[PDB]
Write a protein that binds this ligand. Structure first.
Ligand SMILES: CCCCCCCCCCCCCCCCCC(=O)OC[C@H](COP(=O)(O)OCCN)OC(=O)CCCCCCCCCCCCCCCCC
Ligand SMILES: CCCCCCCCCCCCCCCCCC(=O)OC[C@H](COP(=O)(O)OCCN)OC(=O)CCCCCCCCCCCCCCCCC
Ligand SMILES: CCCCCCCCCCCCCCCCCCCC
Ligand SMILES: CCCCCCCCCCCCCCCCCCCC
Lengths: 504, 467, 54, 100
């Protein structure tokens, strides 16, 4: 019953940031902090109240807390929310990254910050609704309604050093990609609903009703193909990945849009929740293609990330490679691989959040992002080079950080299922270390290659240092003690895996 | 069969619009007063709109050999009456700057609304032809209202010649159909049939040519950007909304009530026309710098989507409500967009950075640009979802693929206009305020019925004709 | 060799195709009335022929 | 006793001749003349259709057809007078400033 409020209080908070903007320029940031603190507090309350550690697996469906309201009764469409361990973990991560995004844009005294904050929490409420909703039309509605504030923020509030045409082009490319993939997902959803109506005779858009749908082979393959095309653009999966570095590079220079918008990957949650249980046989047949797409994504993203002269573009390609690892993890049908996938998504979100925040602050210090114009920056700032060294160490899969735990349980489950893809992915981890070292050496080590890197730069303030140290502590605790996270998602992942491997 | 008083009770909007046409005529002849005749036209249109309630309380009846009145005719009559009311509301501040006479505009708008109502109530070939011509002729007058301006005269000449040619084509196809069947009623086309005979097929093809001209369908679509740009902005609003709504309503009535809709060849050529219309109308608006030509190609694409929803009418029973919902959303979005254009063009003399001097109009314009793209939280998405569901249900995969591709292209140019509203550029009268209120309620209705579309579904499904 | 992102250009190919097709189709809107009537006649012939072949 | 096919063929011949005069002629007056030819041809086809079935519906449709013909002829004549007044020639191919 707290889930409708969990979606709503970001929207009410964004409306309050827009409305209380007339009270002063410095007011809506405080309102946004209060409402994201409240959203994170309710997510943690659901974590402490759900009892996720001692929960068994009763089969799909098994929701810890659900909500029903009729929305379009003509089609049997409901505002239908449901939370379990995986959804709760992603909602907590959403609240954390939303708090970090609000804190990261604290130094803006611009004239129209109210609409910036309104679009930010519209994005946050949309992605929270994607995680919570299981009704197909409502899930699709959140999936495409979180898209408009992303476009507006990238186009209007984006990177000030670039022209308006480049920001407009990047935003339009991202919007066209994501909304066309939403449209083909809607085609798959509609065809699934019509197949269920022809089988039974009742208008159901509900996720639990669509599971017991008899489909011939070939139709289910096409529905799975539409779902995978949507979740492949949104992952990203190559070659459907060109929107990601363009949207990251022309994002706002504070860095809040990267954390709130794209750094929570709804596509892998959609694959775990919708692509695998609704289409078990089609996904089992598609597993070689998806796993080889993951291999190509890992190596392609590494080869991009080594060859980028832009640090933000580099981190975007790190995201491409890590989500290629997650894509390999999804299509194995293993308990250990799925749990490693969950750990890898959480750790990648935290590590890329730290990397994006530190890159934004580096750009604020030095007023450039080209990696050929900077060097020897370890002796020029106080805290930023060491923290970026820690996060670049985290992103290459280092023990003591959750990335190693997630990637290694992914590889253990995969090698239990397929060995060759596992060994090629481990060489992809070698490539990941290569690009992380290249970024570190071309960014902070060496001699000064320009004049802006030859002078002493001001240090980071207390707020940004506190949030970066919070991310560091969270990554260390995830790496050294991931057991509460594994026990939180043990029931839902087990239900999904049992549904996937028991129907084939 | 004779005319009963219940028939005139069901004939309330037609009689009211004719009576207010005569009243506006006599008031113009008495004295040239812009405000008085404008108020008379708005009063007559509102009287027809509230007489729709008494028409609904009467019931569905076949009032003439010509007309049939049901929820279908009621819904389309309400749509064209709303379009005419918005056209008058947008036209008055534009007409405040007209140096010539400003009184014939409302007379022509009322006569075109009468033609639209008669098209909505049509159940006969003669009624269909007369309604098409009664839509077209006041549009000839209104498009070339500012004939001193060059472009208005260009659009008037082009529209008049092309629509006379299309009327000749439609009438020849009508004559061939009547030679085949022998009855001009909408239910007796091919009742004597072996449903495929070349004379009836050729006649229906020529009527398809005429109606596809009137619906801006490819390849009879070349007039649409020219006529839309040349005409005055309230005339562009009326031609985008009321003409398309009425002609597509009578097209659906013809293709539902006749047994010729079961023929596979007409469905195949309609699928070809719908595919070509969607792709051509979306591709032609990629590099359009003018808003009127862009909205004309938008009208071509949206009528292609309506064609896709119409093709699957014989298989599924949910196509008609899909067309009703899409036409309501398209009417509201076109009203908002063309109303912002008209308020920016008013008063008549002779959009980059619009938010920095006119923020509410920019908000309405970007909401309607989001709505026309089929983006959620808007009514155009609900219409596109209905069209896609209807196409999926009857297994029209080429058409839904064309819908997805055209929606992506429309996304590109609509969102380009939307961001151009918010870039950096290098009235004071209650009629202009009334136009602003009209476009604001249009945007609010689009947003509310995008979030919560179910009441519109209930109203549309309650508008159920004789199956 | 890969720093130009070849897959991005491979997926940007249909955007170029859409732009080229739109610019080609915009040449038909030359603004001539006799061409519009001729195109209406061409479309009538095309739809009548498609109805006759089926 | 008179075939319907011959009357329909006559009407079709007149219709396509009117369309030929509509397309190939550049002066606006001859386009209006060709439009009159097509509307008379469609009306003629309606009269043959009504005479084959022995009904007055074809004649009523002819009446509606020529009412439309007269109204469109008056409207086009007024528009042509406007074009000749503000351009001083009846070249219809110069009406091309609206393109793209
Ligand atoms: C897995 C493959 C099969 C399934 C595919 C499902 C669809 C979803 C996933 C694929 C999406 C592909 C999108 C490709 C275009 C992305 C946007 C883009 O590149 O825009 C570039 C450009 C706008 O940028 P700008 O430079 O400002 O404009 C030039 C100035 N005249 O744009 C323009 O100038 C015009 C843009 C027009 C709209 C975009 C083109 C859409 C065409 C239909 C594509 C449908 C999918 C086809 C199959 C995949 C591709 C082979
Ligand atoms: C470019 C962007 C847009 C993408 C392209 C546009 C969409 C393309 C969709 C292609 C679909 C091809 C279908 C081929 C077979 C059709 C005839 C047939 O036999 O259909 C089977 C079935 C109808 O027969 P039925 O008796 O209902 O059998 C069901 C038994 N349970 O059929 C059904 O019940 C419904 C079958 C639906 C199949 C899936 C359609 C959507 C797939 C996702 C999107 C396209 C791929 C990406
Ligand atoms: C660089 C600063 C840009 C400021 C843009 C402000 C936009 C405000 C929009 C207000 C609401 C309009 C309707 C949205 C739907
Ligand atoms: C540019 C528009 C592309 C549209 C592609 C549509 C493909 C439809 C394929 C249908 C196959 C049916 C098989 C039975």
């Amino acid at each position: 019953m707290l889930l409708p409020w969990l979606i709503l209080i970001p929207f009410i908070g964004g409306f309050l940031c827009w409305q209380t903007e007339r009270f002063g320029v410095k007011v809506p940031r405080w309102i946004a902090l209060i409402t994201m603190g409240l959203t994170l507090a309710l997510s943690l309350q659901l974590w402490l109240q759900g009892g996720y550690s001692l929960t068994q697996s009763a089969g799909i469906p098994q929701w810890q807390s659900e909500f029903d309201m009729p929305w379009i009764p003509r089609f049997g469409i409901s505002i239908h929310l449901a939370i379990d361990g995986l959804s709760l973990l992603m909602v907590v991560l959403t609240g954390l990254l939303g708090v970090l995004a609000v804190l990261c844009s604290w130094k803006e005294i611009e004239k129209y910050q109210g609409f910036f904050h309104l679009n930010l929490m519209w994005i946050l409420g949309g992605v929270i609704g994607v995680f919570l909703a299981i009704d197909m039309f409502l899930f699709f509605f959140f999936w495409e309604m979180m898209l408009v504030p992303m476009y507006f923020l990238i186009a209007l509030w984006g990177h000030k050093a670039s022209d308006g045409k480049t920001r407009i082009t990047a935003a339009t490319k991202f919007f066209i990609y994501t909304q066309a993939s939403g449209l083909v997902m809607l085609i798959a959803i509609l065809a699934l609903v019509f197949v269920h109506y022809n089988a039974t005779g009742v208008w159901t858009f509900n996720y639990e009703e669509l599971l017991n749908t008899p489909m011939s082979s070939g139709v289910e393959y096409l529905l799975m193909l539409g779902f995978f095309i949507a979740f492949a653009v949104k992952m990203p999966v190559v070659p459907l990945h060109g929107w990601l570095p363009d949207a990251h590079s022309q994002a706002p220079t504070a860095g809040s849009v990267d954390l709130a918008g794209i750094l929570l990957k709804t596509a892998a949650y959609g694959l775990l929740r919708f692509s695998l249980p609704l289409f078990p046989n089609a996904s089992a047949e598609f597993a070689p293609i998806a796993m080889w797409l993951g291999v190509i994504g890992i190596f392609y993203g590494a080869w991009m990330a080594f060859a980028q002269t832009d640090i933000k573009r580099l981190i975007a390609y790190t995201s491409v490679s890590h989500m290629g690892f997650v894509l390999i993890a999804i299509y194995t049908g293993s308990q250990l691989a799925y749990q490693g996938a969950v750990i890898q998504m959480i750790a990648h979100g935290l590590s890329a959040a730290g990397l994006f925040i530190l890159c934004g602050q580096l750009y604020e210090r030095i007023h450039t992002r080209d990696m050929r114009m900077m060097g020897g920056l370890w002796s020029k700032m106080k805290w930023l080079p060491a923290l970026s060294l820690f996060f670049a160490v985290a992103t290459l899969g280092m023990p003591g950080t959750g990335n190693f735990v997630g990637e290694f349980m992914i590889l253990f489950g995969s090698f239990q299922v397929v060995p060759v893809i596992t060994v090629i992915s481990t060489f992809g981890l070698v490539f990941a270390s290569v690009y992380s070292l290249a970024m570190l050496h071309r960014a902070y080590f060496g001699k000064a290659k320009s004049q802006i890197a030859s002078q002493e730069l001001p240090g980071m303030s207390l707020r940004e240092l506190f949030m970066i140290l919070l991310l560091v502590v969270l990554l260390v605790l995830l790496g050294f003690y991931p057991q509460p996270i594994l026990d939180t998602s043990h029931s839902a992942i087990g239900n999904i895996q049992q549904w996937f491997v028991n129907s084939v | 069969m004779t005319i009963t008083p219940q028939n005139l009770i069901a004939l309330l909007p037609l009689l009211i619009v004719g009576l207010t046409v005569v009243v506006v005529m006599l008031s113009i002849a008495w004295r040239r007063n812009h405000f008085l005749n404008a108020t008379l036209s708005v009063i007559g249109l509102n009287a027809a709109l509230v007489s729709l309630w008494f028409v609904g309380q009467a019931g569905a009846m076949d009032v003439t050999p010509l007309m049939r009145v049901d929820g279908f005719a009621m819904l389309y009559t309400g749509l064209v009456l709303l379009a005419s009311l918005a056209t008058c509301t947008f036209a008055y501040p534009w007409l405040e700057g007209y140096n010539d006479n400003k009184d014939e505009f409302y007379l022509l708008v009322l006569i075109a609304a009468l033609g639209g109502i008669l098209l909505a109530n049509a159940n006969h070939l003669a009624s269909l032809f007369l309604g098409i011509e009664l839509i077209s002729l006041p549009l000839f007058g209104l498009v070339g209202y500012a004939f001193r301006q060059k472009r208005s005269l260009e659009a008037s000449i082009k529209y008049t010649i092309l629509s006379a040619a299309a009327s000749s084509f439609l009438l020849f196809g009508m004559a061939l159909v009547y030679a085949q069947s022998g009855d001009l009623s909408f239910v007796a086309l091919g009742k004597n049939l072996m449903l495929n005979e070349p004379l009836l097929l050729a006649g229906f093809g020529l009527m398809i040519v005429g109606l596809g001209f009137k619906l801006s369908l490819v390849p009879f679509h070349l007039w649409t950007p020219d006529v839309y740009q040349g005409a005055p902005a309230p005339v562009s609003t009326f031609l985008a909304t009321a003409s398309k709504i009425a002609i597509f309503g009578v097209v659906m009535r013809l293709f539902l009530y006749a047994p010729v809709g079961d023929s596979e060849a007409i469905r195949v050529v309609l699928a070809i026309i719908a595919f070509a219309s969607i792709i051509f109308g979306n591709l032609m608006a990629l590099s359009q710098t003018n808003i009127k030509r862009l909205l004309g190609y938008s009208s071509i694409s949206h009528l292609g989507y309506l064609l896709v929803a119409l093709i699957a009418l014989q298989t599924g029973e949910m196509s008609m409500e899909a067309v009703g919902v899409y036409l309501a959303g398209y009417l509201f979005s076109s009203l908002g967009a063309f109303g912002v254009v008209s308020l920016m063009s008013s008063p008549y003399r002779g959009y980059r950075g619009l938010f920095w001097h006119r923020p509410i109009l920019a908000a309405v314009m970007t909401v309607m640009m989001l709505s026309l793209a089929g983006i959620p939280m808007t009514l155009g998405f609900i219409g596109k979802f209905y069209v896609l569901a209807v196409g999926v249900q009857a297994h029209l995969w080429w058409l839904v693929g064309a819908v997805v591709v055209g929606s992506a292209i429309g996304l590109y140019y609509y969102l380009r206009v939307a961001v151009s509203l918010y870039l950096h550029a290098p009235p004071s009268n209650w009629q202009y305020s009334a136009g602003g209120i009209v476009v604001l309620i249009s945007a609010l209705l689009v947003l509310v019925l995008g979030v919560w579309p179910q009441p519109l579904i209930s109203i549309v499904r309650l508008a159920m004709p004789l199956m | 060799l890969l720093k130009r992102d070849p897959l991005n250009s491979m997926m940007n190919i249909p955007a170029v195709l859409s732009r080229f097709a739109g610019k080609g189709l915009l040449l038909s809107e030359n603004g001539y009335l006799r061409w519009y009537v001729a195109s209406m006649s061409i479309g009538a012939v095309v739809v009548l022929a498609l109805l006759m072949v089926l | 006793m008179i075939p319907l096919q011959h009357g329909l063929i006559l009407a079709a011949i007149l219709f396509v001749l009117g369309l030929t005069g509509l397309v190939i002629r550049r002066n606006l007056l001859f386009m209006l003349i060709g439009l009159e030819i097509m509307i008379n041809a469609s009306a003629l086809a309606f009269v043959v259709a009504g005479s084959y079935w022995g009904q007055t519906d074809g004649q009523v449709m002819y009446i509606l057809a020529i009412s439309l013909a007269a109204a469109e002829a008056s409207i086009g004549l007024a528009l042509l007078l406007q074009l000749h007044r503000r351009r001083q020639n009846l070249n219809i191919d110069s009406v091309s400033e609206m393109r793209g």
